[PDB]
Every structure is written in C-alpha cells, then in structure tokens.
Design a protein around this ligand. Structure first.
Ligand SMILES: *[C@@H]1O[C@H](CO)[C@@H](O[C@@H]2O[C@H](CO)[C@@H](O[C@@H]3O[C@H](CO[C@H]4O[C@H](CO)[C@@H](O)[C@H](O)[C@@H]4O)[C@@H](O)[C@H](O[C@H]4O[C@H](CO)[C@@H](O)[C@H](O)[C@@H]4O)[C@@H]3O)[C@H](O)[C@H]2NC(C)=O)[C@H](O)[C@H]1NC(C)=O
Ligand SMILES: *[C@@H]1O[C@H](CO)[C@@H](O[C@@H]2O[C@H](CO)[C@@H](O[C@@H]3O[C@H](CO[C@H]4O[C@H](CO)[C@@H](O)[C@H](O)[C@@H]4O)[C@@H](O)[C@H](O[C@H]4O[C@H](CO)[C@@H](O)[C@H](O)[C@@H]4O)[C@@H]3O)[C@H](O)[C@H]2NC(C)=O)[C@H](O)[C@H]1NC(C)=O
Lengths: 209, 209
C-alpha cells in the first residue's frame, strides 16, 4: 500500500491561478474496504471539497486518487497540506504532506529549434524545445502561435531528467504544417517555473525560415 | 518482487555483433535463500553459459541479474529466449520471455543542434539531437568527436515515445566544453537502428560555431 502526494502544476498555479494537489493511493492487495482520504492544513484552516476517484486496474489492484483544490495565495505563502490515509485492516495510518519548496532553486534556460527540410516531407516540420538547468523538477510547457496557446495534445514533453551539473532538463516536441508557418512563421515555446522571474515564465521563439 | 527481461541493444546486435539479454530481478524483501534464474529457448536449443550477479541497494533492496549472450543470426531469425525465476518463498515461479519485435520497419531521421551561449556560462554549450519517425522503438544513440566515441556517462537519452504518426522519437543531450570544439568544432550524433540503411547506421554532424 503506497500513498503519493503531488504538488500543483506551475501552469495551474501561475497562469490559471487555480492550483490543485492530488493524493494518489496504490494498493497492491486490497480487501475492497473503505479507504478514507482526509485532507487537512497545518494552520488549522479549512480545506475545500475534494474530488475522489477509484479505479480497478488490469493487474488486480485498486488506485484511489483525490484531488484537492488549493488557494493560490495560500500555496505561494507556504501552507502545508496533508493527506491522511486510513483503512480498517492496515497497521497504521499513512500520512503524506506537501508544501512549496524552501530549498535550492534555479530558473530554466530555454532553447527553441526547427528541423531542416527532409527529402520527401517539405510540408512537414518538427519544432523542438530544450529546457534545462532548472530546479525543482516541477515545470509546465506551452506552445504558442499567433499569440495563442495551442492545445496540449499537439505537443509532447519528456519526463524531467537530471543534468550532469545540477538541476533537470526536459525536451518538448511539436509537429507543424506548411499552412501554419506560411500564415505566420513564428512559434513560441514557453516554460512555466517558480524560479523564473519576474513572472515565473521563460519563453523563446523559433521560425522555419 | 518483479522481474524484467530486456532485448539486445541495436549497438551490441549490429555494430559489435555480440548481443546479450538480461533477466533483471528486483526483490524488495531480501530473504535468505538463493534465487534461481534458469534460461531456455522456445525452440529447445542449447542456451550458452550465463552470468549471475548480486548486489544490495541503499534502500534495503536486493538486485539479482543474469546476462545471457545470444547469437546474432538466431535473434534476427526470430528466436524467443525465456527466463524462469524461482524465489525460495513463493509457490508459483515467475516467467519472462523476450524476442525480436515484429512490425513494419522505418528508417530514423536524425537532426542535431547546438545551443547558443547562455549568459555567464561561456566555456560550455549543450548539443541536442532529435531522432524521430522510426520503428520499432529499439534504438541505440551515441556521440562522437574526432571519430572517437564519447563515454555513455557524458550524454543522456530519453525513452522512446510515440509520434503523431506511427513512429517513435527520442531526444539526446550532450554538454560539450570550450577545449573540445576549439580543437575540432564538429560533433557527430549517430543512431543505430535495424532499418537504418545502408549499414545499420544514420548520423548527422553539428558545430558550435
Ligand atoms: C498494477 O498496475 C498499476 C498501474 O496500472 C500500478 O500502479 C502504479 O504504481 C506506481 C508506483 O507503485 C505509480 O507510480 C508512481 O507515480 C507517482 C506520480 O507521478 C506519476 O504521475 C505523474 C502525473 O500523473 C507524472 O507527471 C509523473 O511523471 C509520474 O508518471 C510518482 O510520484 C511515484 O514515484 C516517483 O516519483 C518520486 C518523486 O516524487 C520518486 O521519489 C520515485 O522514485 C518515483 O520516481 C511513482 O512513479 C503509478 O502511478 C501507478 N499507476 C497508476 C495508473 O495508478 C501498480 O503498482 C501495479 N501493481 C503491482 C503489484 O505491480
Ligand atoms: C530501491 O532502489 C532501487 C535502485 O537502486 C530500485 O530498483 C529499481 O526498480 C525499478 C522498478 O522495478 C527498476 O526500473 C525498471 O527498469 C526497467 C528497465 O531498466 C532500465 O535501466 C537499466 C539500468 O540498470 C537498463 O539496463 C535497462 O536497459 C533500462 O534502461 C524497466 O523495464 C521497468 O519497467 C518500465 O518499462 C516497462 C516496459 O517494458 C514498462 O512496462 C513499465 O511501466 C516501466 O516504464 C522499470 O522501470 C530499476 O531497474 C531498478 N534499479 C536497479 C538499479 O535495479 C528499487 O525499486 C527501489 N525500491 C523501491 C521500494 O522503490
């Protein structure tokens, strides 16, 4: 029986200003009892109503995830949120807590690229974004075009991996069509990160030329 | 407990022409008694002598691995190798099999990029490589300078993800130093793939400039 507690996405925190936290509970061998997920703050202030979802998996195990809406100001000013997990036939109560980092920070470096022509695909182009040397690993990536954010499904971002020096890197990939760049030849890759200043974002544009 | 069985890397398979497979056994509860890893083929032909290895991790976990060398021709022609795992404290043994993935083939497209100078850090640059539109997902990636292969610890390659089409993509990152590019400002990103004509390889060169 595992219990994980994740922090809000930077996008939800700093752009949409509606953060949430998710308490994920994985139970290898469940008795199908009533696992209770109670939320609480360190200050004693009340918590908003949380969503809950249970799902049986193919490998014979139940996952319970509860998502708790959190206040923007509250998180940014350093509130500690706790997920208490309880089950009748379980030795003790698992307790996971989360809060905004007070350890080392580093803004990300962003670099945007556009692939050259490849024989037999002159209408297609792949744009790629390197984002590196940032910490913590919490980061959100968006692609913009005509000053407008494209749907998330359009692009693909890799999992945060450690760099050799310090911090993390991720790559983001976005396929684009001739129509797009001929309409306007400028695509922005934007990273959202708490260590970034002054507004928690760092973005870079690239063109197909 | 959980067991994993990998396939041979394209490099070992096609370039060194001495492929091996590994049966990894992760034991979260190190109990007394020797764990058994027995090898076999689907055809029922003799397997070569394998290598057993044991080591305890920092998180109180035991890691036992057995590596079996396999034949080049044998693997390509579609042999299935098999690893039967037997722990002292378990009734039914765990079995894992591996074999050459079979589907349509596609050659990889390689693209290689160099970052511009980031404020402050002038004595180093990051090189990026995008390798996309290939299948199956198996692919080796290596960096070279002066026709000399750099150590694997120097670069970092992401796990193969699905593209919007029908192929897979992978990124690879390598930090270089001022002493290296001033000696010879050219770096090769080389990918080894089954469908990579003409000699199982595709590469592309890049410069810091
Ligand atoms: C039967 O099958 C189910 C799934 O079908 C298995 O359930 C999975 O269990 C694993 C671990 O037991 C879960 O993995 C954990 O995910 C956490 C959340 O992060 C993931 O999800 C977010 C967003 O969804 C992604 O952004 C992120 O990249 C991850 O993919 C991680 O936090 C967990 O730990 C990892 O991160 C921490 C740092 O916080 C590290 O310290 C850890 O080392 C580790 O890297 C972990 O990865 C997984 O989510 C479960 N899947 C589902 C669908 O719920 C059962 O375990 C399996 N049963 C058996 C017996 O095998
Ligand atoms: C205590 O700490 C140890 C490490 O010190 C942890 O051991 C690791 O456990 C995880 C989970 O089993 C292992 O991760 C698995 O890796 C497999 C592939 O191995 C890669 O890395 C090795 C390098 O040793 C390479 O040789 C290999 O080629 C790979 O690059 C994956 O196959 C496993 O599953 C993943 O892939 C499959 C696809 O087939 C997916 O289905 C899965 O979803 C998943 O993505 C898995 O990721 C890891 O290998 C172990 N490390 C070591 C050093 O042995 C213990 O787990 C940890 N204890 C606890 C309780 O967490």
């Amino acid at each position: 029986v595992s219990a994980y507690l994740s922090r809000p996405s930077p996008f939800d925190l700093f752009i949409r200003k509606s953060p949430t936290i998710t308490c994920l509970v994985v139970d290898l061998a469940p008795s199908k009892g009533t696992v209770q997920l109670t939320w609480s703050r360190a200050s004693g202030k009340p918590v908003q109503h949380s969503t809950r979802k249970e799902e049986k998996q193919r490998n014979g195990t139940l996952t319970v995830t509860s998502t708790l809406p959190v206040g923007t100001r509250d998180w940014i000013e350093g509130e500690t949120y706790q997920c208490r997990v309880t089950h009748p036939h379980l030795p003790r109560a698992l307790m996971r807590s989360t809060t905004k980092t007070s350890g080392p920070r580093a803004a990300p470096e962003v670099y945007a690229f556009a692939t050259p022509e490849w024989p037999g695909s002159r209408d297609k182009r792949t744009l790629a974004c390197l984002i590196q040397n940032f910490m913590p690993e919490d980061i959100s990536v968006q692609w913009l075009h005509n000053e407008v954010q494209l749907p998330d499904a359009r692009h693909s971002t890799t999992q945060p991996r450690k760099t050799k020096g310090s911090g993390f890197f991720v790559f983001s990939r976005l396929e684009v069509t001739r129509a797009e760049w001929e309409q306007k030849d400028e695509f922005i890759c934007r990273a959202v990160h708490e260590a970034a200043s002054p507004s928690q974002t760092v973005q870079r544009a690239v063109s197909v030329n």
